[PDB]
Amino acid sequence: SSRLFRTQFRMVSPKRISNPNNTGDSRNCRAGVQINDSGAALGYYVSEDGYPGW
């Protein structure tokens, strides 16, 4: 893009954030959110928008 500001924001629905490959919750990865040694988050796992079932 060639505009004045190149910053943009996308709204993500909470349903998308899930563990990769639909596995269970490990100690350091609860509900698709990475957790460090303390309670703070480090990174998030985002699925892909699948409208068709396949």
**Within 16-35, which residues bind other proteins (CB under 8 A)?**
23-24
Q: Is 48 a binder of other proteins (CB under 8 A)? A: no
Q: Is 49 a binder of other proteins (CB under 8 A)? A: yes
Closest-CA residue to 17 (of 42, 48, 39): 48
Least Cβ distance, residue 54 to other proteins (angstroms) = 4
- Contact residues toward other proteins (CB under 8 A) are 13, 15, 23-24, 49-54
